[PDB]
Design a protein around this ligand. Structure first.
Ligand SMILES: Nc1ncnc2c1ncn2[C@@H]1O[C@H](COP(=O)(O)OP(=O)(O)O)[C@@H](O)[C@H]1O
Ligand SMILES: Nc1ncnc2c1ncn2[C@@H]1O[C@H](COP(=O)(O)OP(=O)(O)O)[C@@H](O)[C@H]1O
Ligand SMILES: [Mg+2]
Ligand SMILES: [Mg+2]
Lengths: 131, 367, 367
């Protein structure tokens, strides 16, 4: 059951990301990669949800499932872009440390929201397998 | 396998498997279509948010309580309640559990039929029983005689039951409490300059109705002591930070229960419905309804109730008579705790309707 | 074949293919016809210099920024902008790339129709979508709740959006900032005795507006420490070698953003439109707007912003209610970084306009 597997994987990636963001400038490349690895996993969640949706039979559940999975691409796209901007923003000394910290925080907030979107998707996926 | 005890709560729908502890899910229900235009790419958003998410997300929606004075106006949303609950809350298929549904003591025809028929064909529950709500708190209260007062937003009821035969000549449905108490409270919240008037904006009020209202010893002197400067005022903090200091209206709102003269509405206080229901029951039996008066429904959780009610009844009641009011803790789950007992009663599983026999006999059997 | 994210920047028009860093072309827009007689015979010189050569060739021309009050003054210059960029900057066929155009939050009718209609008929763009500038910054700020401040020379705007339903009854267009700040700055640059009157001479001012100006913490006290002799003056070097030493006006000019009574324009400080816009939004939502306040547009690069803004708002704001206003570094390309995210979303490519539906349905229901 890859949805449960993906949800656990997403949690492990987020636990690691929380750890990487507590660390230094040495976690720069890793942070860019972390965002990439999260983006690959979201593309898998989205893909699985579309495949499951095709085999699903109740229109309401199918619609509710389609409603939640369609926001995942947009958040994953935003993560790749905002990470590319932040990545290129590190290594510059003119910009303020508080503004830099806020970029890390914003990225964390967006990751938390992505995780919440997946959390809601998991919840709906679990319920759909009953019918 | 296991039965699920499912209460169509007036508020405050309650769900939890058959006993012995508590409803796994209790929720104010609510369905809300989104009032404002969406600019989210996707859009990817629920057509209507049900509770809980519509009570985290208020306002950007238009909240509709689907059961209006106990009448399920459209079952389309009711079915969505059922489905949402069963699948994404309790996480179960209705075919698996024989179910137990509750209804009110008095509701028109065909409210229970249309429900039963749709629920059998839509959710294909294998067996069912549909109980009037007052009776389940009797099984919950474990009393063998007495008048049951079932009070939730927006319909109250007053049912007399004796060992173990019902008193039809004394069954009262009052449509009064509580959503109108909510509306009245909102009307006296305009008096403190806070106009949270829209339907959605009403929910916060319901929360101040939960938490902040109090009940006095006696009106006239609480009205007096309100004229005293002494601070009855309690400070609510609002979801935009605002601090609201309410007091007179704090004891004023529940007093409606004793006197509907505040709404005006032409029905008498619990005081009189008690007396007049007792005085629609046989003399001999009047002895034992007195001291087996049972209040219920989540709304009744105001501390000066019942001894305000007691003192009021004692004033109208005949001398030396033993009057005692039975008040459970946590009356909101009284009903649910009722239901758990019922469905557990063997052999009365074979007094539960079964889908095949329903296939054979249709709605005729229902009554 | 790839899409082009092309922003009608009010500055500082920005253009760059989809992602992943920045616009490949940024330019301050300007077209300028040559004010003086050309004597070197022929002379093989263009009717108007576009940027950048018109910012080399300041003054021998008369510079005209075409978007006037953000509105396309004439499309003769706008189309020439479009062509100049597409061919002579980016080097791309409008026929080839599905394009993405941006527009503002609030503008009159039919300037976006007329734009779109002309752009389809002139450049024969195959597919297109036209976005309001505030929204792209939401994806560019990875947010989905909050008030957006979009500020470029010379129109600011104030947009509230909530997860992700927009609040139309709280969308405000201020024509205040920044080109009028440029004009006011020029008027207080007369106080240090240097003339910058002409259209061209205004650009140098804009450059001192970029580089030299700063924002304080509190006006009265910055005015106090300005009376202190100590070096506040910063020395600009001017294209005829001149050294301009500015200080009082150095913090004075941006402070106008919190006080437009300095220009005198009746319009209120962003401070107050913020509070009043928050206080034009539903109570419950006020909770998550507090701390999702996003400022934007290249003008917003002044260090006393946002904690000046914060400190001012906090004086009017509800007690102990958390607010945070901080927005990304490099806000000028914030928008552009928005656009990249949008246009990549399939299937919402099929929420773009296609030439066949432009042929069949014309410029109906564009809005
Ligand atoms: N502490 C409280 N004080 C007053 N009202 C309360 C309190 N707690 C819950 N309520 C009310 O209880 C009502 C629910 O009653 P309920 O027990 O659900 O009645 P029923 O089962 O008949 O539908 C709600 O509408 C809610 O406002
Ligand atoms: N360091 C700076 N300080 C102040 N203003 C700046 C600075 N850098 C650029 N600007 C201003 O940014 C403006 C452009 O904002 P822009 O991001 O193009 O707004 P928009 O996209 O809404 O049109 C220009 O008019 C320019 O004067
Ligand atoms: Mg009830
Ligand atoms: Mg702008």
């Amino acid at each position: 059951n890859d949805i449960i597997a993906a949800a656990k994987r997403m949690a492990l990636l987020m636990a690691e990301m929380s750890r990487l963001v507590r660390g230094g400038s040495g976690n720069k490349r890793a942070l860019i990669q972390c965002a990439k690895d999260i983006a690959k996993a979201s593309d898998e969640v989205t893909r699985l949800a579309k495949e499951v949706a095709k085999q699903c039979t109740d229109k309401r559940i199918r619609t509710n499932l389609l409603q939640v999975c369609e926001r995942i691409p947009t958040i994953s796209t935003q993560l790749k872009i905002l990470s590319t901007v932040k990545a290129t923003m590190l290594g510059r000394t003119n910009i303020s440390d508080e503004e830099s910290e806020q970029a890390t925080e914003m990225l964390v907030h967006n990751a938390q929201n992505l995780m919440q979107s997946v959390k809601e998707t998991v919840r709906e996926a679990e319920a759909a397998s009953i019918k | 396998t296991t039965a699920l005890v499912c209460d169509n709560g007036s508020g405050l729908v309650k769900a939890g498997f058959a006993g012995d502890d508590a409803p796994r899910a209790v929720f104010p229900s609510i369905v809300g279509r989104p009032r404002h235009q969406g600019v989210m790419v996707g859009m990817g958003q629920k057509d209507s948010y049900v509770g809980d998410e519509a009570q985290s997300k208020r306002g950007i929606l238009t909240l509709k309580y689907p059961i209006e004075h106990g009448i399920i106006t459209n079952w389309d949303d009711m079915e969505k309640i059922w489905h949402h609950t069963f699948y994404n809350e309790l996480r179960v298929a209705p075919e698996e559990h024989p179910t137990l549904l509750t209804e009110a003591p008095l509701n028109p025809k065909a409210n229970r039929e249309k429900m039963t028929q749709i629920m059998f064909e839509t959710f294909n529950v294998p067996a069912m029983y549909v109980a009037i709500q007052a009776v389940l708190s009797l099984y919950a209260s474990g009393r063998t005689t007495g008048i049951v007062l079932d009070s939730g937003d927006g319909v109250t009821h007053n049912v007399p039951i004796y060992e173990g035969y019902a008193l039809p000549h004394a069954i009262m449905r009052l449509d009064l409490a509580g959503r109108d108490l909510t509306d009245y409270l909102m009307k006296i919240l305009t008096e403190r300059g806070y106009s949270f008037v829209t339907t959605a904006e009403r929910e916060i009020v319901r929360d101040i109705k939960e938490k902040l209202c109090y009940v006095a010893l006696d009106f006239e002197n609480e009205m007096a002591t309100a004229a005293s400067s002494s601070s009855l005022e309690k400070s609510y903090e609002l979801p935009d930070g605002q601090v609201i200091t309410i007091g007179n209206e704090r004891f004023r709102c529940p007093e409606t229960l004793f006197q509907p003269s505040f709404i005006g509405m032409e029905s008498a206080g619990i005081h009189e419905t008690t007396y007049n229901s007792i005085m629609k029951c046989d003399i001999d039996i009047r002895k034992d309804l007195y001291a087996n008066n049972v209040m219920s429904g989540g709304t009744t959780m105001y501390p000066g109730i019942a001894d305000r009610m007691q003192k009021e009844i004692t004033a109208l009641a005949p001398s030396t008579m033993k009057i005692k009011i039975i008040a459970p803790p946590e009356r909101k789950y009284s009903v649910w705790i009722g239901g758990s007992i019922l469905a557990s009663l063997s052999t009365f599983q074979q007094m539960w309707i079964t889908k095949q026999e329903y296939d054979e006999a249709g709605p005729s059997i229902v009554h």
